[PDB]
Subunit: 254 residues, 2 copies
Amino acid sequence: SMRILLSNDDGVHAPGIQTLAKALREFADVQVVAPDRNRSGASNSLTLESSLRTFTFDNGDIAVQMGTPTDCVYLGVNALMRPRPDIVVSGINAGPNLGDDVIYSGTVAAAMAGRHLGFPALAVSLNGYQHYDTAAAVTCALLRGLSREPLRTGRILNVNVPDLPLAQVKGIRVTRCGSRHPADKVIPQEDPRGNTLYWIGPPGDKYDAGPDTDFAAVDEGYVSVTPLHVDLTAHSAHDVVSDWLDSVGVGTQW
Amino acid sequence: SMRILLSNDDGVHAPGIQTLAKALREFADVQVVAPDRNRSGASNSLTLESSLRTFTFDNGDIAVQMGTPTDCVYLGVNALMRPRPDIVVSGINAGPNLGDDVIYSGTVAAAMAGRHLGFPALAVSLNGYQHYDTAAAVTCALLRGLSREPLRTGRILNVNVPDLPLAQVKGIRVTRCGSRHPADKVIPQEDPRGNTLYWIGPPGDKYDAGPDTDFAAVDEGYVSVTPLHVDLTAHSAHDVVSDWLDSVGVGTQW
Ligand SMILES: [Mg+2]
Ligand SMILES: [Mg+2]
């Protein structure tokens, strides 16, 4: 009955999106529009300079060739899926999307692209690689919840599932995004001709990971549910910025 | 005296970043780490699957080959620039970065990557293609302001400059991000073999563009300054989401 646009950032060949597709197919109409390769770190990137080609597999799965997760959802909703989906579900990602990492997340971005549909979009990420079935079960519960009663406020739900058997999941926590210290590591590596190439290093250590953060919930064995929005305004900085400008005389003659 | 990491998303061959480099060089030490091509829509994407090669031009400008604006700033701060920069400036972009478009913006993303440095990073975008000198002048004023007195709160400043002679700029407004209606257009286009390719269409119409939004300030001929943060949490949705979960019985047996 429910029309689900299913995407991810790991690609069409990810167990995560496959497991979830099979699970969601049990009770809903599902359509897989996904990248052709691992587009981790793709964030909210989208293809503007080129048009997009859509490669279909035997099972019906639509890849978008060179496509970003945002491209996939954009095409899914406006072009490919008829009738238009009720919800976008993104995942299950192999790996967590927590804290300030969510801005870099293609999984999150796919969900953010579905923010205007009738149901809040779900980004679903597993804190590891083992228990997709656990994350599938959590995803299905939320969808079951959405069918029972619509979520009035909150247009995106960032969901992170501990890499545990479902029996060991302690429950669900409504959380806020934590944050890390700045990532400072670059990993240099020479090419055969001696030229120095650079790899982006690991993330910074956790900084803001308290009582109520997505980090802490997951570390404790709870599902973290964070409502997300696309408004990047640091609203609490408004007055400080205004007073600063006046104090330094920028934008005023006096 | 001031150490500036200068990046963009238009590329090394953009007049925008060139104009600003020459202008900033008048009073500060500037280093251009930028993409090799037009990476508009690159958002906060970053290269994880590959290491990165850095192409230097005669004038000193460092391109990062296949590099995203985030890659450029990441490498700039942690690897390339010694001593470490005091600030990241990103722009001047050819085109506005306003409203909910900022999540897709490589220009903004480059600035967000510099959020941990001693000075708030600046993303600078021109509402058109003509008056880079105007945007350069606004950028220099803000930097002049920062040298006079440090900005206590707000780690990123999204700056949008009307495409006007400086004399016609009305002043500066501290704004919040506006928003648009959902973008719904896809532009189909056949390839020589008859296959249908899809272009991402134009943005949706402005929805939230009032008294205090970045959209309205720019339309009125003011510089818009929006403090941005990387926290995507829709904080006001917290209680609604929690009550919803309990009501539908997800995460509770009862
Ligand atoms: Mg991934
Ligand atoms: Mg651009």
